[PDB]
Swiss-Prot record, chains A, B:
Subunit note: Homodimer. Lamin dimers then assemble into dimeric head-to-tail polymers. Ultimately, two head-to-tail polymers assemble laterally into a protofilament with a uniformly shaped rod of 3.5 nm in diameter. Interacts with SPAG4 and SEPT12.
Annotated localization: Nucleus lamina
Crosslink feature (Glycyl lysine isopeptide (Lys-Gly) (interchain with G-Cter in SUMO2)) location: K102, K117
Family the entry assigns: Belongs to the intermediate filament family.
Residues of the full protein shown: 431 to 548 of 586
Top-rank lineage group of the source organism: Eukaryota
Positions of post-translational Phosphoserine modification: S104
Implicated disorder: Leukodystrophy, demyelinating, adult-onset, autosomal dominant, typical: A slowly progressive and fatal demyelinating leukodystrophy, presenting in the fourth or fifth decade of life. Clinically characterized by early autonomic abnormalities, pyramidal and cerebellar dysfunction, and symmetric demyelination of the CNS. It differs from multiple sclerosis and other demyelinating disorders in that neuropathology shows preservation of oligodendroglia in the presence of subtotal demyelination and lack of astrogliosis. Leukodystrophy, demyelinating, adult-onset, autosomal dominant, atypical: An autosomal dominant, slowly progressive disorder characterized by pyramidal signs with muscle weakness, spasticity, dysarthria, dysautonomia, and demyelinating leukodystrophy affecting the cerebrum and cortico-spinal tracts while sparing the cerebellum. Patients usually do not present with autonomic symptoms.
Protein name: Lamin-B1
UniProt source species: Homo sapiens (Human)
Impact noted for substituting A6V: Found in a family with amyotrophic lateral sclerosis carrying a probable causative mutation in MATR3; uncertain significance
Function: Lamins are intermediate filament proteins that assemble into a filamentous meshwork, and which constitute the major components of the nuclear lamina, a fibrous layer on the nucleoplasmic side of the inner nuclear membrane. Lamins provide a framework for the nuclear envelope, bridging the nuclear envelope and chromatin, thereby playing an important role in nuclear assembly, chromatin organization, nuclear membrane and telomere dynamics.
Length: 118, 118
């Protein structure tokens, strides 16, 4: 049934898209701090594609994660380890989700999918 | 530079191939505990395809990671969290790796890559 796919071209990799639809977690695989200012994260469930734009001064430090929770998730924001998506609630479950991460230029530096079949 | 790849058709997925060359970590993303008896990890470096056959009754519980430590790594076994690979030592650095998980039937349930390009 469940099927996962992933890719990366650098330090940051998308680690998990929650099956219950409450968070998206990224991680810095490298040992070098990655400035993520101006980066973008586009989550596409079918037709809709919602984009989270990182703050101008964000730095995902080495070997550490960032968990973008939804507003309805019930988890408060404690940056930098945890952040909250502004004005976007849970995306839901059962639908194919694909999350694309884009740098400041606009290239795709990472991806992750969760295609459901039956 | 460094690239990444991943695939999964079930609960168990491969989470990291050590760049230094000391461990291969998996995880049971789903809530279902997975019976992992007789499964095999074919770590394909270049031509060689060394493989680790699992115990008869090992089970990866929900949201639980297993790390197949090398012999020369220096970490003692502490099952079920960590396990050791018999007489395999280090993969090395700068080597393109591919670790393929195999179920008891012989099918592939996971995949990971770490293609290094200067």
């Amino acid at each position: 049934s469940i099927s996962h796919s992933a890719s990366a071209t650098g330090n940051v990799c998308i680690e998990e898209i929650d099956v219950d639809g409450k968070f998206i977690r990224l991680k810095n695989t490298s040992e070098q701090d990655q400035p993520m200012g101006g980066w973008e994260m586009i989550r596409k469930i079918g037709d809709t594609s919602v984009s989270y734009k990182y703050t101008s001064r964000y730095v995902l430090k080495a070997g550490q994660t960032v968990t973008i929770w939804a507003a309805n998730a019930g988890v408060t924001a404690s940056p930098p380890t945890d952040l909250i998506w502004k004005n976007q609630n849970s995306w839901g479950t059962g639908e194919d989700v694909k999350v694309i991460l884009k740098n400041s230029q606009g290239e795709e530096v990472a991806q992750r999918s969760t295609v459901f079949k039956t």
